[PDB]
Write a protein that binds this DNA or RNA. Structure first.
Lengths: 36, 426, 106, 107, 53, 36, 53, 53
DNA sequence: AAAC
DNA sequence: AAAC
DNA sequence: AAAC
DNA sequence: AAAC
């Protein structure tokens, strides 16, 4: 259960850079080979 | 054939971007992740909170609350879910609630409305449970709609109205608080012993009225505890609170030199520590943006209710410590207060609270998030925030009153086979 | 930016081509979560049962199971359980035709 | 009047003797203690187990299992119980199941 | 005998039930060994072949 | 939750001696005075 | 009445345990991939029968 | 034109991925050994489809 | 191609 | 629910 | 008479 | 439920 709040992240906003988590794992896409 | 009977738990990256927008006092879903029994969930939401451009420079920070709740499906489908799990593979598929035909009519659940117009009932019901257990005033009736299509376009698109931050007027005692209690006495005697008893019963009443309207509270009162399963309540996993701010933009042309526009950019971070999911459910994350309830016409109770009696002005502790709740009207604390709109206050409350002062020069001045006329309506309409009270505060934009761009870093330690275990027959 | 190619021995006559590609993550303004947009949920879709996912054929889905104006006639084969290995980005409907965001509108 | 609004938790001795008898594979209740929310419960049952006299000498020991379970009332009255607690003093009194007219028919 | 229930915190109002069950191992006077009572013995019944079982 | 069993209290049975717990507390009977 | 202590006769597999499982096949072909799947479903059945009722 | 960054919709399995595979069986028997073989061949297919084009 |  |  |  |  919930508690301390913290959006008080002192900083100027940064443009969203990348929708891929923090820790990844196994492979997810199979397309027949490499695709850039 | 032999099949791939197991799986080994490994980290699943369910991270995603969030492009959000809402109104001021409405609770809106900004992210949802369906969880499986036995997985471990963790999230790091980091983004920026922006308000629509305001008409003049910054004057007051707004406060932001971000919440993450867990709602087990059992909680939503009850018996039906239990049976589904037991039945297994041939279980009858789960019920789906109905939405109104519009793209934003399921937006309160942080989702685009499918063309078919239906969504999983757990998504709609979980929201109601969250609202009814932590956001409505304890004394208002639960929200009991069967399908999202029963909602107005503002509830459906922007989320349900939340209450204002507590005030003398914003947080009055519950509506039915009794101001007196009769003991039916006989004509020329009273039973000294019954009287005693009379007091014991009222006590018990009084406590349920003021602090225990909810079953879970009545038990804590006994010094016992109740699981979230005991009363079916969504479990609050994490909550972050913050004040959003920014800076003013100085105009510099011939006509707007001396003029400013407040720019609220607020970097925030919502972190949910690892969480073990005991049974299949959804993890709901919601946002609520609010301003302190500053009205441009609230008066100090002693300055607006006539002639002052000894009871009102002296601060006599024996009086305040011993008389019934005082019933007051919206007119005792507001310049255009409806004398017909009453509320019960604690005696001496006026000495425990101080309203903010807004000089009359600011009354209809656009660009300040102040409430311009005193809320008119029943107790419930006055405590529930009305987003239009803030319309004259901002520049008119397509992204409502606040917008956020977040990166939901979410890791789930789940146990399902690999995407290829999955696409390989052998 | 800085693009550095360490020394390279050219074994036979040829061209050295240097190309650029600029792209945005594929954020659509109308993608829905598979479980939220394909009807009634069966045990196979909602339970996360590893024996099921680890053993049945690829699932054929339509553009309509994941998009608000998806063409039901446009199909695609997905791995069973893919919906539990992936999460789409969410764009509130207030942004749908708002110019200035590099989102895919339809 | 001012009333006795509190109480301070202190040990309550709810000890009692038990004179029992049963059949061989049947589960029988030998003790029950009603508990209030927030109390702490502890018990030490110490006695002797006897079989009816047998027709010849001992040949095989029997095995004995003693169990203590907790059953919350909510579990039994559901919604009705929840409402009772909330309603408080004027709650409608709780339902009572029916037995057969005999002294041992609730044994 | 002695039955000891360590301290227990009662979270909500309820009953504490204590029950007894007395039983004897199920010794029948006429049980036979499966292999001794089901006719002729096949390879599957007598060999203990792990791949079969 | 339940666990180890112990009626294995090695001993000859003893006649029940007293129905009053192990730890008592406050007074329970009020009869107007002392009564043996 | 309680159950006896476990035996071969006292603790048999649950009454409805299936002794076979059909996969409706076509007349002159079987789907190698459906078969696989067939096995995944029975598994799930089998577990609920034996350990998870 | 280049492809989008991988998605569920942007990176589906290759178009011709088979969702089933028939083994032509006889009318009232299947060859336990051919079946085995059937699986070995699909494997080889499956890999070329998904990872080795 | 998170592979006996 | 700043609680005998 | 587990008592201001 | 002596479990990939």
């Amino acid at each position: 259960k919930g508690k301390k709040r913290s959006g008080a992240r002192p900083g100027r906003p940064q443009p969203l850079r990348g929708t891929k988590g923090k820790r990844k794992g196994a492979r997810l896409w199979y397309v027949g080979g490499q695709q850039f | 054939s032999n099949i791939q009977t197991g799986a080994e738990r490994m980290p699943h990256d369910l991270s995603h971007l969030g492009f959000l927008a809402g109104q001021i006092g409405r609770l809106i879903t900004i992210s949802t992740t369906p969880v499986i029994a036995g997985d471990s969930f963790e999230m790091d939401a980091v983004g920026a909170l922006r308000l629509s451009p305001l008409r003049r420079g910054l004057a007051i920070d707004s406060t932001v609350d971000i919440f993450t709740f867990y709602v087990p499906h059992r909680h939503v489908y009850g018996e039906q879910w239990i049976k589904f799990m037991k039945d297994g593979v041939n279980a009858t598929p789960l019920p789906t609630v109905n939405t109104t035909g519009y793209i934003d009519h399921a937006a309160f659940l942080g989702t685009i409305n499918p063309d078919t117009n239906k969504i999983p009932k757990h998504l709609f019901q979980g929201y109601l449970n969250i609202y009814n257990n932590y956001f409505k005033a304890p004394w208002m009736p639960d929200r009991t709609e069967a399908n999202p299509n029963e909602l107005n376009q503002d509830d459906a698109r922007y989320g349900f109205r939340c209450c204002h931050l507590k005030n003398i007027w914003t947080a009055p005692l519950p509506p039915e608080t009794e101001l007196s209690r009769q003991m039916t006495t006989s004509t020329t005697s009273i039973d000294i012993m019954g009287l005693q008893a009379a007091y014991a019963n009222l006590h018990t009443d009084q406590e349920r009225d003021y602090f225990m309207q909810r079953y879970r509270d009545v038990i804590s009162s006994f010094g016992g505890k109740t699981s979230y399963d005991a009363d079916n309540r969504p479990l609050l996993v994490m909550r972050s609170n913050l004040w959003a701010s920014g800076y003013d933009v100085d105009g510099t042309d011939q006509t707007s030199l001396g003029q400013f526009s407040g720019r609220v950019q607020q970097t925030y971070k919502h972190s949910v520590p690892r969480f073990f999911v005991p049974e299949h459910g959804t993890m709901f994350t919601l946002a609520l943006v609010r301003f302190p309830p500053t009205a441009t016409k609230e008066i100090q109770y002693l300055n607006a209710k006539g002639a002052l009696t000894y009871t009102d002005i002296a601060g006599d502790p024996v009086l305040y410590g011993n008389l019934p709740p005082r019933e007051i009207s919206m007119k005792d604390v507001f310049r255009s207060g409806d004398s017909s709109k009453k509320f019960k206050i604690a005696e001496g409350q006026w000495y425990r609270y101080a309203p903010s002062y807004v000089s009359p020069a600011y009354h209809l001045l656009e660009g300040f998030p102040f409430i311009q006329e005193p809320p008119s309506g029943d107790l419930q309409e006055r405590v529930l925030i009305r987003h239009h009270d803030y319309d004259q505060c901002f520049q008119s934009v397509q992204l409502l009153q606040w917008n956020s761009q977040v990166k939901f870093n979410v890791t789930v330690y789940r146990n399902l086979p690999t995407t290829r275990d999955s696409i390989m027959t052998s």
